[PDB]
Amino acid sequence: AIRKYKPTTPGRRGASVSDFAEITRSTPEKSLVRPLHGRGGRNAHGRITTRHKGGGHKRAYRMIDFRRNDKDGVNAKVAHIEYDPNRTARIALLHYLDGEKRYIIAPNGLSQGDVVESGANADIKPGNNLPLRNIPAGTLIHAVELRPGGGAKLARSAGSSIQLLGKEASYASLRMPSGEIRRVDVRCRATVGEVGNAEQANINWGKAGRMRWKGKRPSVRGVVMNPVDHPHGGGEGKTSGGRHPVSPWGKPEGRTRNANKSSNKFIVRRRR
RNA sequence: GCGGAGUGAUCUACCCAUGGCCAGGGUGAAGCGCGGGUAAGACCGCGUGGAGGCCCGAACCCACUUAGGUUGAAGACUGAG
RNA sequence: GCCAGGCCAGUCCGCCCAGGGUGAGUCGGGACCUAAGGCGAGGCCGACAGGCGUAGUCGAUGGACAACGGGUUGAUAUUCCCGUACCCGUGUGUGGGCGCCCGUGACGAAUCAGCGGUACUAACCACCCAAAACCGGAUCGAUCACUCCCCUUCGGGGGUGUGGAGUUCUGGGGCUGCGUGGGAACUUCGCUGGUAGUAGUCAAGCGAAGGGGUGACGCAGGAAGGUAGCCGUACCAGUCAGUGGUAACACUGGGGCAAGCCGGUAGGGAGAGCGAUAGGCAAAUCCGUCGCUCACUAAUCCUGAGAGGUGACGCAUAGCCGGUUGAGGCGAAUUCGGUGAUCCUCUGCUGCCAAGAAAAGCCUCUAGCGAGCACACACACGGCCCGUACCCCAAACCGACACAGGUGGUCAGGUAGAGCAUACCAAGGCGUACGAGAUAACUAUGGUUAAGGAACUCGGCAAAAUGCCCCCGUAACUUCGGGAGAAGGGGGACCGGAAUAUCGUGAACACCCUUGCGGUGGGAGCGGGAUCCGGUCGCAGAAACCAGUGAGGAGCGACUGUUUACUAAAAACACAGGUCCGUGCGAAGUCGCAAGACGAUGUAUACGGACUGACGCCUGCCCGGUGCUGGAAGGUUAAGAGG
RNA sequence: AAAUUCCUUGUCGGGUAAGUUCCGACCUGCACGAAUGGCGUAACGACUUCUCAACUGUCUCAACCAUAGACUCGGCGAAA
RNA sequence: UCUGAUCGUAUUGGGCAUCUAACCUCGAACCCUGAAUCGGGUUUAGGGACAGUGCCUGGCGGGUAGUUUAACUGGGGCGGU
RNA sequence: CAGCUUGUUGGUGGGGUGACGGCCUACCAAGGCGACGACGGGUAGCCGGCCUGAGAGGGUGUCCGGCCACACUGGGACUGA
RNA sequence: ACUGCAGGGGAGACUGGAAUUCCUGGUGUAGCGGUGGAAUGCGCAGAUAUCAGGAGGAACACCGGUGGCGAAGGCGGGUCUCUGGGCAGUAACUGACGCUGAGGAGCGAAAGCGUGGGGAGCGAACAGGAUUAGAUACCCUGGUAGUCCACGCCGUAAACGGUGGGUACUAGGUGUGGGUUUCCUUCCUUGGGAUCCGUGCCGUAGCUAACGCAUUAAGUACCCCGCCUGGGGAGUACGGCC
RNA sequence: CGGGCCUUGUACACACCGCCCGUCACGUCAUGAAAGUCGGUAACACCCGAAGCCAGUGGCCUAACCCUCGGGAGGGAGCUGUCGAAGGUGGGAUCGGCGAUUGGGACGAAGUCGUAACAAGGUAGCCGUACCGGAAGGUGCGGCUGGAUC
RNA sequence: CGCGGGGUGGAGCAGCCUGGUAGCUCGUCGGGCUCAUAACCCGAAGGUCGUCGGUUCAAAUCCGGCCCCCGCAACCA
RNA sequence: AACAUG
Ligand SMILES: [Mg+2]
Ligand SMILES: [Mg+2]
Ligand SMILES: [Mg+2]
Ligand SMILES: [Mg+2]
Ligand SMILES: [Mg+2]
Ligand SMILES: [Mg+2]
Ligand SMILES: [Mg+2]
Ligand SMILES: [Mg+2]
Ligand SMILES: [Mg+2]
Ligand SMILES: [Mg+2]
Ligand SMILES: [Mg+2]
Ligand SMILES: [Mg+2]
Ligand SMILES: [Mg+2]
Ligand SMILES: [Mg+2]
Ligand SMILES: [Mg+2]
Ligand SMILES: [Mg+2]
Ligand SMILES: [Mg+2]
Ligand SMILES: [Mg+2]
Ligand SMILES: [Mg+2]
Ligand SMILES: [Mg+2]
Ligand SMILES: [Mg+2]
Ligand SMILES: [Mg+2]
Ligand SMILES: [Mg+2]
Ligand SMILES: [Mg+2]
Ligand SMILES: [Mg+2]
Ligand SMILES: [Mg+2]
Ligand SMILES: [Mg+2]
Ligand SMILES: [Mg+2]
Ligand SMILES: [Mg+2]
Ligand SMILES: [Mg+2]
Ligand SMILES: [Mg+2]
Ligand SMILES: [Mg+2]
Ligand SMILES: [Mg+2]
Ligand SMILES: [Mg+2]
Ligand SMILES: [Mg+2]
Ligand SMILES: [Mg+2]
Ligand SMILES: [Mg+2]
Ligand SMILES: [Mg+2]
Ligand SMILES: [Mg+2]
Ligand SMILES: [Mg+2]
Ligand SMILES: [Mg+2]
Ligand SMILES: [Mg+2]
Ligand SMILES: [Mg+2]
Ligand SMILES: [Mg+2]
Ligand SMILES: [Mg+2]
Ligand SMILES: [Mg+2]
Ligand SMILES: [Mg+2]
Ligand SMILES: [Mg+2]
Ligand SMILES: [Mg+2]
Ligand SMILES: [Mg+2]
Ligand SMILES: [Mg+2]
Ligand SMILES: [Mg+2]
Ligand SMILES: [Mg+2]
Ligand SMILES: [Mg+2]
Ligand SMILES: [Mg+2]
Ligand SMILES: [Mg+2]
Ligand SMILES: [Mg+2]
Ligand SMILES: [Mg+2]
Ligand SMILES: [Mg+2]
Ligand SMILES: [Mg+2]
Ligand SMILES: [Mg+2]
Ligand SMILES: [Mg+2]
Ligand SMILES: [Mg+2]
Ligand SMILES: [Mg+2]
Ligand SMILES: [Mg+2]
Ligand SMILES: [Mg+2]
Ligand SMILES: [Mg+2]
Ligand SMILES: [Mg+2]
Ligand SMILES: [Mg+2]
Ligand SMILES: [Mg+2]
Ligand SMILES: [Mg+2]
Ligand SMILES: [Mg+2]
Ligand SMILES: [Mg+2]
Ligand SMILES: [Mg+2]
Ligand SMILES: [Mg+2]
Ligand SMILES: [Mg+2]
Ligand SMILES: [Mg+2]
Ligand SMILES: [Mg+2]
Ligand SMILES: [Mg+2]
Ligand SMILES: [Mg+2]
Ligand SMILES: [Mg+2]
Ligand SMILES: [Mg+2]
Ligand SMILES: [Mg+2]
Ligand SMILES: [Mg+2]
Ligand SMILES: [Mg+2]
Ligand SMILES: [Mg+2]
Ligand SMILES: [Mg+2]
Ligand SMILES: [Mg+2]
Ligand SMILES: [Mg+2]
Ligand SMILES: [Mg+2]
Ligand SMILES: [Mg+2]
Ligand SMILES: [Mg+2]
Ligand SMILES: [Mg+2]
Ligand SMILES: [Mg+2]
Ligand SMILES: [Mg+2]
Ligand SMILES: [Mg+2]
Ligand SMILES: [Mg+2]
Ligand SMILES: [Mg+2]
Ligand SMILES: [Mg+2]
Ligand SMILES: [Mg+2]
Ligand SMILES: [Mg+2]
Ligand SMILES: [Mg+2]
Ligand SMILES: [Mg+2]
Ligand SMILES: [Mg+2]
Ligand SMILES: [Mg+2]
Ligand SMILES: [Mg+2]
Ligand SMILES: [Mg+2]
Ligand SMILES: [Mg+2]
Ligand SMILES: [Mg+2]
Ligand SMILES: [Mg+2]
Ligand SMILES: [Mg+2]
Ligand SMILES: [Mg+2]
Ligand SMILES: [Mg+2]
Ligand SMILES: [Mg+2]
Ligand SMILES: [Mg+2]
Ligand SMILES: [Mg+2]
Ligand SMILES: [Mg+2]
Ligand SMILES: [Mg+2]
Ligand SMILES: [Mg+2]
Ligand SMILES: [Mg+2]
Ligand SMILES: [Mg+2]
Ligand SMILES: [Mg+2]
Ligand SMILES: [Mg+2]
Ligand SMILES: [Mg+2]
Ligand SMILES: [Mg+2]
Ligand SMILES: [Mg+2]
Ligand SMILES: [Mg+2]
């Protein structure tokens, strides 16, 4: 579902786009929309804390239900599959039988009109949300919460999933999408399946301005700066940087995780 | 030139929110039709459509060449491109 | 007014002096609303100073919200005046209505009373578990008692039958207890006469706390329908411009008028009832969801440019008289076409991905309030605050100057033209502040040049050249799009004929009709576009102005793009694509002493760093040096302990 | 023999009447080299470089014309 | 009384495991609260003597700061002294 | 050598020739040819015959006889049966 | 067409056990590994061995053969779902509807290519060790692409039976795969006979230069297609197509 | 180490002291590529166009016929146009020659360096394909017997 | 020209600031092995330590002079 | 292990 353009212009030579074949109803649901504004990388002090940000198209926030705690047994119906500019997945509008509208991340294979269950008595179908205690092992899940009642945090980009390895007593072993083996509580909730829109990694954005539309502002290498600007700056022709490679703030490469962070008791294995 | 305490982003650099502007001419992407061709197709020829950091060109934004200016009309500009 | 100032003079002036002059329910703002951002009660944080921030409160460049045409002054006018509207509020009448107090209109249970569900499960029964002990076949080894038999150093085995304490398979009790499972009282509910058509609820209006709907949003591209504007013309009022012609349609002027209201056209838009309702912080008749029935093909309803009506028995106007040529008075005709927007229908329609503010306001629901309300006509009233003069592509603003510079938006007519380019002109403005002369060199800005044609020079620098429209025709290479307007050619004016339906645009008179802002033919008048043949003219028909030079070979960077404001626009930077490294979530990273923030309302197909820079084919060897990652056997080593 | 080659105008071929620049090779790489990427590449460039047609006051070699100055008169009137 | 082993008593210290009450939580709910994604309180779910922080102590540290880097010399540099 | 063809393929009315005919012209139709080799390229005057061969074939076109083409190269008409 | 029958024919989804490797924990102590002989290497920081748990990938012991199926390439763990062909009998139906097929089209082992996954073991390249005059090899220790999957491209093989398809005929003997039918049918014996379709071995006539083929022809014949014309140069250059 | 017999493989037969492969160096012959350069041939488009035919025009010239004796009729020259050879300009097509430098090919004698094939050729060999290497060749993956000698 | 390395048997390298011995590898020579040659095996030989001239009882070694070879420098207008 | 050549 990746349409390739034809090379009519130099900016559309290798370019490609989504086919958008999964989407019904091009407009969002008006009560579930909150406004956003840009920042350009600036914090509350007004200074750039994240470089290469700004420009970008105007956006509105779609309220996603990352909790799904309060409808255990009330079934829902997938009404539409909509575009969300705020993320790489598509979103599914749910019509619960009691009368409430919600958005969730659309799993792989949750076409329009499907019924979605929730709670400890749900079926293992793509889109149902259960506690991890009720999911069997080996099941591909997504949108998993770290603490109980805290909201979905893990594996929720497009195409990503967690494999549930095993449950021993009070803890489930998860394989996160990086190869990380993490141990979390079994009262944590997770949605069955795999996040859809899995072909968007193959999109070739064709031109510089197409990434300026998405909010990515240009990026100057440190080796073509001056030594007052970067530790790699300097030289009379072009260099490699006359030192082992560092950040713009002089920090070397290497492990930046806190070596005695509190969650080391929960990590079985680091990523590969 | 060194320090202490302050003042400045009405210029300029970038970002944020909300507005406005872009004469005219050309080329003719996707798609959708219709005809063909096939067991079905790919594919093929017409239409239609109006894409694009597309083309030509004013306003507008620039500043490549050149001449003039150089106790200037102007502490950075004019003319022709 | 004229002694300063204005690049000269000045009787003039943006200069000097005195007086005067700026009128709003509707225009632009506040008294209405929020965005980015600001401030910020309490608060959290920080030795102090202070940092951030919640409620809240400000903040238009945006949202909502009521006015048009004419006349008037020396100076203001959507503000004054005249005509005609619209919006919010207030009082007083008059008029019926709708309610409270009254009735009424439906709805409407709470006393008590007979069994099932078959609760309760005592119990009996289904099931089978070591199916509490136990009898008993049987299991097994180096225990062990009596007795028959053999050897010896006199301590113990083999042939092991019977049997004690028993491992084992189970013949077998298998009652119970241990279980679930149908399964009585106690106790409790579904119904039925019944306290019962009984108390009670609701039945004017207002609700703005709150709920819900709406408000409410991108970009590109039209098409169809109109309209303004413009150009002609019926008709109207005038002209004779001392020249060869021209006495009237030959020429010149006119051929006007808004908001509002009426109207509902073209075009757009929507199925409607009734019931239930885990949701909307309380409630809901509203919203959401679900269900049935009918409607569906339609009709109806809302919407909606324009036409037409009215506003207009008014106002204006060409012109004619009158004129201290300042005032004044009178005042014609106004029809039908063409062409046509950047405006309107249209916040509509189609397509696209990059997925496109909030809040008031408005409508609706209920909580709540509530005995008097709602409404029509008439008359009489209130409608506050600030801005308004003037200049505003400039001599009044920013550049020290009346400075060739800079300054956002709206209006934008004619002939030619594709055009808001260009040339000439209208309406309207201006000749802008030193002049007058004079054929010196020389300098600047334009123009032309015989023969030659890059011989010039670091270099074709500059100049010249090409240039439009329609029709032919077009190479290597290529990523199949391009290259390409490649290259290289031909035609082009005027007059007449084809030519009255030649052709194509719109479509009047009258025929015809389901009676209307209708349809069908019908074809006048008005403009548009080429083509063919014939003729005529010049040196030249793209006519002036305007208006691509082309082709070939290398390097570098793929490309469009950015950059040293003021000597460097590039081969530098950026880029899409690549790879490595970090990061498991108030993540890493950054800003802060911290709190807090950003990253991101994101979650490894994500985010940050580094290097390489579309694409094609590729990217070899070295881990000794130095970093990075992991390890911890050995050596050495801090404070503390020990003393 | 390179945006890299000092020696150096290396040598050979092409282009010119004549070519220290240009294109094609050679390898003797002072001092090339694979993501400070290696070698190619259609399209594109106010980029650098060499050649051709056309075209001309760039030149052989200048000559004339008009305007703004310079120049005379009157007025005002500085500067380093 | 010695080296080696073992054991008792008393004292001191390190591992290892569990606990909950310090402390911790941007996990959840309720109240202050009329309007509150702030804050505080209350209860619950977790974590837990770990972490964080004070004092002391070792490492690393062009990230930042202040500085030094000689003279002679047929100019200085380079060489030599 | 795989797409050739616009008087090209057919019709009508005229013209033309000794004669039929796109032979020419105007108009109308949209055909015609091709893998049974179109359109290109290479070579060649064709034949009665001659040479060879058992024949079938293969090679050849010289004398003589037939027909064709040309007359320095290219183009054109005149006269005349 | 009907009635039966045999089959690793194909595609999709799910799924099973053994072994290899790795990870975690226990026990354990100094070697393991490898070869003709060694060395590199691994280990003493607790390897190899051994037991329990876990993750992951690839191939499917026995059945299994000389056998089956498919046009060829090819095809064997299980189950389910979708699907193609063949054989035999009946003779119900159609009435020569056939055979071959230049061009063309489709399929087509392995290696390789593109994008995206996955990666146990194996293993080009590469690196070290050995051997040797050398050793860019064979042997040993490691080890990247690749081998796997999804979707496309490639279109070649000693793609072979070195044997193009169709048809008819021309002694038998002898195994084996699938049917059908006959006498004592149970003479249990699943035996012999007949017949149809395969797949092997022997063997007559005939053919062949010989080896050999021989009812599955390389025999006797007819129809159609592909190909050959001494060896090199060369399946190369040039042109075109992909 | 040498011999004898039977059997098996062979690319050996003056017979393994056999046969034989590919780089490298030297010589000759023919051939491919190449910046560029020199030719030939047949067309195409446009510009210009002689002769001549045809179509017009014909103010000037003209014996035959007609006449009203003026002339008329008909003709000719000249001129205009369509077509038109040769020439000019342009962009392609196509067939040859030369070309610094470079790719292989064949053959030369007593050259240099290995030993890949033929025997189990000393690691069975060949085929397709990939990567690598002075060179024959090596290794992987699949395949064939045209090998497997116990 | 400066600076600092180097010259050792036929070739390529040690030995030198550690003054008293000149070494390894290939090669050359003689003998094996083989039908013959390579490879292999045994046994030998071969050097003024670039030249000269000092120091020392004594020099490859230490110190000067030359003659060669190699590397790095030779910059600012 | 081992082994080239004429
Ligand atoms: Mg601030
Ligand atoms: Mg970034
Ligand atoms: Mg720089
Ligand atoms: Mg620094
Ligand atoms: Mg640099
Ligand atoms: Mg450099
Ligand atoms: Mg200061
Ligand atoms: Mg400030
Ligand atoms: Mg600013
Ligand atoms: Mg500011
Ligand atoms: Mg356009
Ligand atoms: Mg199309
Ligand atoms: Mg553009
Ligand atoms: Mg404009
Ligand atoms: Mg200048
Ligand atoms: Mg300009
Ligand atoms: Mg004065
Ligand atoms: Mg004055
Ligand atoms: Mg305070
Ligand atoms: Mg604050
Ligand atoms: Mg605020
Ligand atoms: Mg306000
Ligand atoms: Mg505003
Ligand atoms: Mg005024
Ligand atoms: Mg009024
Ligand atoms: Mg919105
Ligand atoms: Mg007159
Ligand atoms: Mg509703
Ligand atoms: Mg009207
Ligand atoms: Mg229109
Ligand atoms: Mg839309
Ligand atoms: Mg005014
Ligand atoms: Mg000023
Ligand atoms: Mg000015
Ligand atoms: Mg501007
Ligand atoms: Mg105009
Ligand atoms: Mg203009
Ligand atoms: Mg002026
Ligand atoms: Mg003059
Ligand atoms: Mg001239
Ligand atoms: Mg001339
Ligand atoms: Mg010329
Ligand atoms: Mg020239
Ligand atoms: Mg010159
Ligand atoms: Mg010169
Ligand atoms: Mg120029
Ligand atoms: Mg010019
Ligand atoms: Mg080009
Ligand atoms: Mg052109
Ligand atoms: Mg004409
Ligand atoms: Mg003329
Ligand atoms: Mg560039
Ligand atoms: Mg451009
Ligand atoms: Mg700039
Ligand atoms: Mg500059
Ligand atoms: Mg510049
Ligand atoms: Mg952080
Ligand atoms: Mg990563
Ligand atoms: Mg890096
Ligand atoms: Mg770069
Ligand atoms: Mg990048
Ligand atoms: Mg190491
Ligand atoms: Mg370390
Ligand atoms: Mg040279
Ligand atoms: Mg060059
Ligand atoms: Mg060159
Ligand atoms: Mg180097
Ligand atoms: Mg590398
Ligand atoms: Mg590199
Ligand atoms: Mg590069
Ligand atoms: Mg550019
Ligand atoms: Mg000169
Ligand atoms: Mg004077
Ligand atoms: Mg450091
Ligand atoms: Mg420093
Ligand atoms: Mg100091
Ligand atoms: Mg000094
Ligand atoms: Mg000196
Ligand atoms: Mg014709
Ligand atoms: Mg005729
Ligand atoms: Mg005819
Ligand atoms: Mg001939
Ligand atoms: Mg014969
Ligand atoms: Mg003859
Ligand atoms: Mg003759
Ligand atoms: Mg002759
Ligand atoms: Mg004749
Ligand atoms: Mg099967
Ligand atoms: Mg296993
Ligand atoms: Mg593993
Ligand atoms: Mg083990
Ligand atoms: Mg299977
Ligand atoms: Mg019949
Ligand atoms: Mg066939
Ligand atoms: Mg074929
Ligand atoms: Mg295929
Ligand atoms: Mg494969
Ligand atoms: Mg692959
Ligand atoms: Mg891959
Ligand atoms: Mg090796
Ligand atoms: Mg190996
Ligand atoms: Mg590859
Ligand atoms: Mg598959
Ligand atoms: Mg095969
Ligand atoms: Mg074959
Ligand atoms: Mg046959
Ligand atoms: Mg058979
Ligand atoms: Mg046989
Ligand atoms: Mg034969
Ligand atoms: Mg041959
Ligand atoms: Mg080939
Ligand atoms: Mg070829
Ligand atoms: Mg014998
Ligand atoms: Mg033999
Ligand atoms: Mg031999
Ligand atoms: Mg040779
Ligand atoms: Mg050639
Ligand atoms: Mg003529
Ligand atoms: Mg040559
Ligand atoms: Mg061999
Ligand atoms: Mg071999
Ligand atoms: Mg060997
Ligand atoms: Mg071999
Ligand atoms: Mg190898
Ligand atoms: Mg191979
Ligand atoms: Mg093999
Ligand atoms: Mg010897």
* Cβ proximity of A147 and A80 under 8 Å: no
The set of strand C positions with any atom below 7 Å of a protein CB reads 35-38, 52-53, 212-214, 216, 277-280, 287-290, 352-358, 479-481, 558-560, 572-577, 581-592, 596-599, 601-615, 626-630
* Ligand 51 geometric centre to CA of A21 (Å): 72
Left if phi > 0, otherwise alpha if psi is -120 to 50, otherwise beta: which for A200? Answer: alpha
Read off the amino acid at residue A59: R
Tokens read off for A182: 């993490």
Instruction: Work out if A217's Cβ lies within 7 angstroms of strand B.
Output: yes
Q: How many residues does chain A have?
A: 272
Q: What ligand has the least distance to the C-alpha of A272?
A: 58
Residues lying with their CB under 5 A of ligand 5, a single-atom ion = A 235
Dihedral angle sign, alpha carbons of residues A68, A69, A70, A73: positive
* Ligand 55 geometric centre to CA of A224 (Å): 20
Q: Which residue is nearest to nucleotide E51 (CA to C1')?
A: A262
In 3D space, the residue among A263, A71, A53, A72 whose CA is nearest the CA of residue A176 turns out to be A263
Instruction: Look up tokens 């109803």; give the residue.
Output: A25
H/E stretch holding A209: helix A208-213
CB within 7 A of strand D: which residues qualify? A 10, 223, 237-240
Tokens read off for A253: 């490469």
Query: How many H-runs (helices) and E-runs (strands) does chain A carry?
Result: 1, 17
Experimental method reported for this structure? cryo-EM
Nucleotide nearest to A55 (CA to C1'): B15
For every residue of A48-110, DSSP letters joined together read BSSSSB------EEE-B-----S-TT--EEEEEEE--TTSSS-EEEEEETTS-EEEEEPBTT-
Residue–nucleotide distance: A139 CA to E16 C1' (Å): 37
- What distance in Å separates the CA atoms of residue A184 and residue A169, rounded to the nearest whole number? 11
In 3D space, the residue among A75, A266, A77 whose CA is nearest the CA of residue A183 turns out to be A266
* Ligand 9 geometric centre to CA of A53 (Å): 19
Residues 6+ apart with CB under 8 A from A230: A222, A223, A248
Residue–nucleotide distance: A158 CA to C141 C1' (Å): 71
Instruction: Work out if A200's Cβ lies within 7 angstroms of strand G.
Output: no
